[PDB]
């Protein structure tokens, strides 16, 4: 019998694991966007913390 | 112009200017909607939110 289950090498969890790593990306970004730009008045706005 | 010029320090104080006369009392709700927004930015700033 066949084994049906999501893999690391089908299309689909290909696709669920490129969108993820995207998604990490993105937020890796923003945050060094706000470390960098730390003293902006509209950073320092918003919790910097939380 | 002239008079708000000569603030050097234009990051940790603000001049709120009036023109007063009318023979009215509009300076004291001047006053006290200066003195309103004074303490809220001095709330903010303690919180580092500004």
Same mark, same amino acid.
């Given at each position: 019998?066949?084994?049906?289950?999501?893999?690391?090498?089908?299309?689909?969890?290909? &696709?669920?694991?490129?969108?993820?790593?995207?998604?990490?990306?993105?937020? &890796?970004?923003?945050?060094?966007?706000?470390?960098?730009?730390?003293?902006?008045?509209?950073?320092?706005?918003?919790?910097?913390?939380? | 112009?002239?008079?708000?010029?000569?603030?050097?320090?234009?990051?940790?104080?603000?001049?709120?200017?009036?023109?007063?006369?009318?023979?009215?009392?509009?300076?004291?709700?001047?006053?006290?909607?200066?003195?309103?927004?004074?303490?809220?930015?001095?709330?903010?700033?303690?919180?580092?939110?500004?």
């Amino acid at each position: 019998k066949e084994i049906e289950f999501l893999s690391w090498t089908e299309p689909f969890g290909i &696709a669920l694991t490129l969108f993820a790593v995207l998604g990490i990306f993105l937020t &890796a970004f923003v945050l060094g966007v706000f470390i960098k730009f730390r003293n902006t008045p509209i950073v320092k706005a918003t919790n910097r913390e939380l | 112009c002239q008079f708000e010029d000569l603030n050097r320090r234009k990051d940790t104080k603000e001049i709120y200017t009036h023109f007063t006369c009318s023979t009215d009392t509009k300076n004291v709700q001047f006053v006290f909607d200066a003195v309103t927004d004074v303490i809220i930015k001095n709330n903010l700033k303690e919180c580092g939110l500004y």
